[PDB]
A paper describes a structure:
[name], recently identified from the Marine Atlas of Tara Oceans Unigenes (MATOUv1) database of eukaryotic genes, displays exceptional catalytic performance against its best identified substrate, isobutyraldehyde, as well as having broader substrate scope than other nat‐AmDHs.
Following subcloning and expression using pETYSBLIC‐3 C, which equips [name] with a 12 amino acid extension leading to the hexahistidine tag at the N‐terminus, further crystals, formed in the presence of both NADP+ and the reaction product cyclohexylamine, were obtained, with an improved resolution of 2.08 Å. In this case the crystals were obtained in space group P321 with one molecule in the asymmetric unit, which was in the closed conformation equivalent to that observed with the C monomer of the NADP+‐only complex (rmsd of 0.40 Å over 340 Cα atoms). In this structure, the omit maps revealed clear electron density adjacent to E111, which was modelled and refined successfully as cyclohexylamine. The ligand was, as expected, positioned with its ring plane sandwiched between the nicotinamide ring of NADP+ and the side chain of Y171 and with its nitrogen atom 2.5 Ångstroms from the OE2 carboxylate atom of E111. The ligand cyclohexylamine (CHA) is also bound in a different orientation, with the cyclohexyl ring more in plane with the side chain of Y171 and the nicotinamide ring of NADP+. The resulting data were refined to a resolution of 2.08 Å and the experimental maps clearly showed density corresponding to CHA in the active site. The structure of [name] in complex with cyclohexylamine suggests that the improved activity for the production of N‐methyl cyclohexylamine may be due to the increased space afforded by the L−A mutation in the roof of the active site, permitting improved binding of the relevant alkyl imine intermediate from solution for reduction. The acquisition of the [name] structure in complex with cyclohexylamine permitted us to model substrates into the active site in order to rationalize the observed stereoselectivity of the enzyme.
Author numbering:
A (entry chain A), B (entry chain A): 8 to 351
The structure:
Amino acid sequence: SPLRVALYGFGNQNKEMAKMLVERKDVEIVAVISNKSNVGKDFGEVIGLAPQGILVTAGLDAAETLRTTNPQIAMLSTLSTVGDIESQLRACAENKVNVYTIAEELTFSWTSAPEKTKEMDELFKEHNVSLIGGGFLDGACCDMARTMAAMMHKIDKLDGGLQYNVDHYGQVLAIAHGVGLSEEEFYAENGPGWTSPTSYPKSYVYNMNDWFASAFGLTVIKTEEVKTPTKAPIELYSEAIGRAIPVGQCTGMIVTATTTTEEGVIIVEKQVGKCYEDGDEDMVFMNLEGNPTGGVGFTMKNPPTPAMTNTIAISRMFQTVDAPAGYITTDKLPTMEAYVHGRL
Amino acid sequence: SPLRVALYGFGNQNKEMAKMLVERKDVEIVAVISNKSNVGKDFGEVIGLAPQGILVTAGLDAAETLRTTNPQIAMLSTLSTVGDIESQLRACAENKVNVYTIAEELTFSWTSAPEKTKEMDELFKEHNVSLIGGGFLDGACCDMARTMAAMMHKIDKLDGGLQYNVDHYGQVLAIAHGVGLSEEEFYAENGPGWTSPTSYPKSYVYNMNDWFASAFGLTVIKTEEVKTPTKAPIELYSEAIGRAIPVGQCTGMIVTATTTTEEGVIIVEKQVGKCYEDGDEDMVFMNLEGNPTGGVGFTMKNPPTPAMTNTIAISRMFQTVDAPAGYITTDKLPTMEAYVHGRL
Ligand SMILES: NC(=O)c1ccc[n+]([C@@H]2O[C@H](COP(=O)([O-])OP(=O)(O)OC[C@H]3O[C@@H](n4cnc5c(N)ncnc54)[C@H](OP(=O)(O)O)[C@@H]3O)[C@@H](O)[C@H]2O)c1
Ligand SMILES: NC(=O)c1ccc[n+]([C@@H]2O[C@H](COP(=O)([O-])OP(=O)(O)OC[C@H]3O[C@@H](n4cnc5c(N)ncnc54)[C@H](OP(=O)(O)O)[C@@H]3O)[C@@H](O)[C@H]2O)c1
Ligand SMILES: [NH3+]C1CCCCC1
Ligand SMILES: [NH3+]C1CCCCC1
């Protein structure tokens, strides 16, 4: 009975997702794949649990590990773009393995990466399995918004976004938000504030704007990004880069994405990713302007964003397995699978 | 093609629901039923639209009006208890008419009214049609909570509620919240703060606690209500009762409902219904304690509660028609039908 589940990647996210998936009598872990870190060790011992008789497999051996242990789904928590994860998707699809990924761009990648996306769509189609993703962006932002949007007669505008602590996802994410950079270093070709329609990767709110445009059945004209550095009126320390941020030096990044459609509906979403002052908490906000009038809005104050990314992924496992073949964006799925007691 | 829709009741709620349902090319209004008010007049003229060639039918003629005009669903916006609406449900069920009602108790009535509810369940079962309801409590409170709850690994406690303006739903609702009453008049057998487990009707949060217990697959031990009057440190005028409320006189009602379950999960929900001070806005709040830890919460500030009650009902029409026979609580339904452009 239990669903055959592979962890593809085994860092901060897939380490916590494991803890929860062990407690779930609904699921069995048949493989754990890292690239290098922890290879050879029993996944449980890594986590602080008793050994489970499943060892961390090597990156280069993924394809054979999936061939053998025959999972129905892979929880792919490695990199953030269809390009970066192409190698791991091919391992999955070729071995008839469905995947749900927390790759942020796979929230909705058809426009940010149409070449690779078309490719992965046709691949998963070929091998009769499903590609789905987005994590926190899928569930806490888009799917919550989708439930609340059901209560609209007409939507003229969606206005929302999220704030997250850029220091708590490691160095790579911090660098990608210009955490250590001068105002001048931040703008510049090799730079995250670089203003150009050719900029890639695209921001999380770009993909999320495309998600709502698909969800609401609208026709995108254009999406534009405005990128500005964040800064602190005091010295802030960054674990991620591992030093003090002087006053006036970039502490992270704001990105607003503005989408126009043929039907006249505007979509604006703001992402704030930065090192935190004392008063700073994670936030999600979504407000709908139209009928009903005055603004139909929800806000989530201080959500445990890291753990919610994993719970969203779990809530998607059976749906991904059951979903049609190819790249399926979650606006084509039911709501995240409902909470019920008795799964443990 | 268009769904055959009867408005059963035609006061403040079903008047606004009509405006929206006319604009929807997806639906056709085949009957409008009041009791007495506006009988004989074209529903459009009542609303401020051009005549639609559908006249307000009389209460006593409901059964024949439904026999004739052959609707698939009735939008029942009359009274608040299975008991009060029994007459209108029988008209519907006997004429093979599905109903979605904004009767607050029908959010989840199995415990507040097990006798009448069993009866209506078996009736709708007999005539191969569906009974569903809750309006704002169903959609803005319970269904939003249900989406957000999907992101929980373990829930130990649900803590939430809503605040609404008790003056803006007319006299009957104001009286039922003790708007004109002395502290002493408020408590007392013939009184809304009357403490007794035999108190009926039950509060909206009682039914909503039962809704979550069903949703989360829990076993209710007991629900208890604590009822306390609200008051203002200044004079407030009430349109609903039509006079000044002296300082210290009840301006409305708080009710907290506390549900214990066999699985150890606690459910607390607070309803505040009162005349508003300057700073007072409608509110919905829902917070989940467990894993993820720290509280997984949403808040909706100043929601247009009256219009959302109607949009929820609209979002439920096709689902009610498609639903199995009998009394179906919305925790057995998909999420409110998603917003899509091109319905008008
Ligand atoms: N959607 C969301 O809300 C959300 C939230 C958080 C993070 N993310 C994204 O999710 C990803 C993972 O986050 P994280 O914090 O867990 O990252 P992490 O701590 O760096 O862990 C990533 C893991 O993937 C492994 N890996 C990388 N390339 C691999 C390959 N080709 N084959 C096999 N394993 C490979 C790494 O191996 P080694 O340990 O050997 O290097 C590591 O175990 C990142 O893209 C991050 O941006 C999305
Ligand atoms: N779930 C929610 O969020 C929510 C929100 C708002 C209100 N409610 C409830 O919804 C109901 C309606 O609200 P409202 O403000 O629209 O009330 P309203 O303004 O008083 O209108 C009620 C309508 O029902 C008609 N009616 C009553 N009994 C009838 C019968 N036996 N046959 C036919 N028609 C009958 C009335 O006829 P006449 O005009 O001739 O009297 C009137 O047209 C109430 O129970 C209210 O408590 C629920
Ligand atoms: N990588 C980010 C994804 C969205 C939440 C914050 C982390
Ligand atoms: N009758 C009340 C139903 C819930 C919202 C406020 C009005």
